[PDB]
Design a protein around this ligand. Structure first.
Ligand SMILES: CNC(=O)[C@@H](NC(=O)[C@H](OCc1ccccc1)[C@H](O)[C@@H](O)[C@@H](OCc1ccccc1)C(=O)N[C@H]1c2ccccc2C[C@H]1O)C(C)C
Lengths: 99, 99
């Protein structure tokens, strides 16, 4: 589809049997979701954005469904105010910026 | 043009007669640039990102050229980690997300 930016580009994602709302964020290198439970081992990581850094838990090889498109990648879980789909997953669904 | 996301979507912008690099960020409601001098009076504003909030200076009706496209709008100046072109200006140059 083609998404205009008059409003925030929010989409429904399916992860770990859960349906959630997330922002398609071209300004984010990684994908970060609000606190939740995911299977497997995880490692600590610090990510920085506007305002400073936050501590998150890194999970690798996580399957996420974005608008029907299956994508595999690293997902960070932590105290983010909004769920963010970053570039590591946007590339997998063939998402591009056009003007 | 069409921009893929395997790398950060950085473009050259021209403002105040000078060239700078900025990130096309669909996850940003507004445009925020690193500390610099702009004309006119400014108003206060607080913007919240991944790690908290920061105080910025808001300047209105500022001319800014993004990849050759001229835009005139609101620009925030403050302690941002990188120059960010947000939705307020992305819509002016007709930028959309596609997949
Ligand atoms: C390397 N670090 C990154 O890539 C990081 N990347 C980032 O933090 C990006 O910033 C550039 C950035 C790039 C590299 C390094 C540092 C910063 C995001 O796209 C950021 O822009 C956006 O985050 C999502 C969000 C949306 C809505 C509410 C709260 C958070 C955000 O904070 N938006 C707010 C904003 C920004 C500017 C002006 C106004 C407003 C209001 C909000 O929309 C993370 C995600 C991994």
């Amino acid at each position: 589809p083609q998404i205009t930016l008059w409003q925030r580009p929010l989409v429904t994602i399916k992860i770990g049997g859960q349906l959630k709302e997330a922002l398609l964020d071209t300004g984010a290198d990684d994908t970060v979701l609000e606190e939740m439970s995911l299977p497997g081992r995880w490692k600590p990581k610090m990510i920085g954005g506007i305002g400073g850094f936050i501590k998150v838990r890194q999970y690798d090889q996580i399957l996420i469904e974005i608008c029907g498109h299956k994508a595999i990648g690293t997902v960070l879980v932590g105290p983010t105010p909004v769920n963010i789909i970053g570039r590591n997953l946007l590339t997998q669904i063939g998402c591009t910026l056009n003007f």
